[PDB]
Design a protein around this ligand. Sequence first.
Ligand SMILES: O=c1ccn([C@@H]2O[C@H](COP(=O)(O)O)[C@@H](O)[C@H]2O)c(=O)[nH]1
Ligand SMILES: O=c1ccn([C@@H]2O[C@H](COP(=O)(O)O)[C@@H](O)[C@H]2O)c(=O)[nH]1
Ligand SMILES: O=c1ccn([C@@H]2O[C@H](COP(=O)(O)O)[C@@H](O)[C@H]2O)c(=O)[nH]1
Ligand SMILES: O=c1ccn([C@@H]2O[C@H](COP(=O)(O)O)[C@@H](O)[C@H]2O)c(=O)[nH]1
Lengths: 171, 167, 168, 165
Amino acid sequence: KAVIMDEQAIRRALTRIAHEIIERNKGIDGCVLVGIKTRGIYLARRLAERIEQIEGAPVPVGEIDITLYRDDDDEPLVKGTNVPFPVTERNVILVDDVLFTGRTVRAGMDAVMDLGRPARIQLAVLVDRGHRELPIRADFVGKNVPTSRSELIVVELDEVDQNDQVSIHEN
Amino acid sequence: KAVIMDEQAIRRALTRIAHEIIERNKDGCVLVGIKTRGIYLARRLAERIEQIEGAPVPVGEIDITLYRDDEPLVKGTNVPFPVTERNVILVDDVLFTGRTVRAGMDAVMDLGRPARIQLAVLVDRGHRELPIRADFVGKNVPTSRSELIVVELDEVDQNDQVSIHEN
Amino acid sequence: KAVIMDEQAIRRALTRIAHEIIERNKGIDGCVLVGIKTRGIYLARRLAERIEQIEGAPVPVGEIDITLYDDEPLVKGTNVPFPVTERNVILVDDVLFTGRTVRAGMDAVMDLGRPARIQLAVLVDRGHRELPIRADFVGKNVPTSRSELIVVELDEVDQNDQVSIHEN
Amino acid sequence: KAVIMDEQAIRRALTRIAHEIIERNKGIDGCVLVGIKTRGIYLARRLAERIEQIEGAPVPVGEIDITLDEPLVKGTNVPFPVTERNVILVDDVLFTGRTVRAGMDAVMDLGRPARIQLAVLVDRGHRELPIRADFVGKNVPTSRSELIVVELDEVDQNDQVSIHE
Ligand SMILES: O=c1ccn([C@@H]2O[C@H](COP(=O)(O)O)[C@@H](O)[C@H]2O)c(=O)[nH]1
Ligand SMILES: O=c1ccn([C@@H]2O[C@H](COP(=O)(O)O)[C@@H](O)[C@H]2O)c(=O)[nH]1
Ligand SMILES: O=c1ccn([C@@H]2O[C@H](COP(=O)(O)O)[C@@H](O)[C@H]2O)c(=O)[nH]1
Ligand SMILES: O=c1ccn([C@@H]2O[C@H](COP(=O)(O)O)[C@@H](O)[C@H]2O)c(=O)[nH]1
């Protein structure tokens, strides 16, 4: 095990991502955040808080539930959605903690597309660890973390582990 | 209305892309072309790779098009090999919003369970509307929304050329 | 000509750069800002103010005067009133084009001392690099043709904040 | 301590970089290669041989001798003009970027090139100056403490790249 981001690094990466989202969309008009799974939902909320602070207006947040990577043959499935607003003609930013193969994000993208025809779908992740297996990229990235295939990235968030931290495990 | 790649620039981009594919994809990989122009580039890429490595590369086809209330949809496929556990490289002429590549990716996923899907395009013109990127890119060409990129290939236009139009 | 950034877009880009600078360096300990030319100096000061607001300690600012005599740019003078040795120096300029101005500025900093790191922040990167130089922090990437020109107007000296493209 | 590129991976990377050099410059007109230090010179010769095979014209090759703890230029054996040329510097590894900046200064003392570009076999990160390669064989992430070692046939009698310490 080793620690690769601490609470401060995380706070700092999220704050920069928020500015980038506002910058790239010329304000938050028409933007919604949709979080993926538990940790993604927590990050999307954090991102929404910060953007409200910065711009003075709130950002809607939505949820998508997808099967687990960890706690094993797999192909991830959307269990459910909780998006209580329209997505058509909106700029939807998916949020997740780690981008690995990209297969989870693709399922989240499909779920949004079943709900509506958004203008744009964008992606924000806290960690991009490589090993992509689909042609998918994040628009906003907190840290690029190289890894070997056998390593694991674990993101601890305050809302459930009571410390904010990112670390690598050898497996 | 300007020419931005000529026959020689196109030849040089494809030859570099073929070497990149081999480097990254060191066995085999397969090529699946999208629409008429994407199928011609995949064939060209396959031919270059056999010349460089001495083995053939299988090539597959996806036919895509548009229908009314907008999104592109898959008409048919001709992939005469299994895609399961394979490294599939989608090929198209231009990456724009990314919606066409997403339909092609979806078609490959119906056929099988590949190990990997990668993307090679001759031109990436920006204005992505989905979170999609190309692994291999011939040229990044900035454009405004109102411009259009037109790729002409020997096989059907009898001149190899890439140009920008407005409208 | 056309307008590609306005006062609000510029403000948002500088605010974001300031947060990236802090993030990348894990706080501003040991960091100094050195602006290049008139417009680069103004941007370095703005960045310094923002960083202070964000982080509560000030950032020293320095200046380098580059003047023009392929007409190669030359360092006229410097006013860096602190040491640069073992510091992280962030050069600041208006527009990154061929990279030749930044290379002179880099050469000036290396005469003054031996820094730990030299980094670069620019408001606009317009391409056409002629030396192997890149910016660490970029406000906006703006594609251009060789013949076009990027003009940055800052409040301090033009009374309007904006960036625009001209031809010839 | 691992092998990160083998002889075949090196061969392929150089072949690809050569095609990228021709593409980016639309042929080799006005292009010269200047290698840095011993290993950079060997790579520049290899690149030049590869480009001649591909385009059927030779590419001149120059040498810059750099030493050490500021790296500084001990020698410059560039027997052609550089003014208005497209000069591609070549080295084995890009680390802090300080060696490449000394090579860039040495070329600028010789004349005014149209362009200076950079080709390296390995880019290992940890830049300390705002410098990047145009052409890169492999991006290899590393920690500050690790070391990249490049072995070439001409002087080590094996072609290989590895990570050390
Ligand atoms: O090292 C990893 C890899 C994957 N995941 C989880 O799986 C998804 C990413 O894997 P993939 O679908 O991109 O392969 C994310 O939701 C992430 O939470 C991790 O938490 N850590
Ligand atoms: O400027 C353009 C835009 C689109 N297309 C064609 O339409 C699709 C555009 O992709 P997208 O907007 O769905 O990414 C591709 O098949 C491509 O052949 C072009 O040829 N040029
Ligand atoms: O389109 C341009 C080109 C150059 N410059 C000015 O010249 C320098 C950048 O040119 P270069 O030396 O990077 O080519 C900067 O100081 C910038 O202020 C511009 O403002 N706009
Ligand atoms: O891991 C390393 C680091 C440096 N160097 C050598 O020293 C210079 C390092 O570059 P830099 O620290 O000057 O960027 C290059 O010539 C290279 O030959 C290596 O070979 N491997």
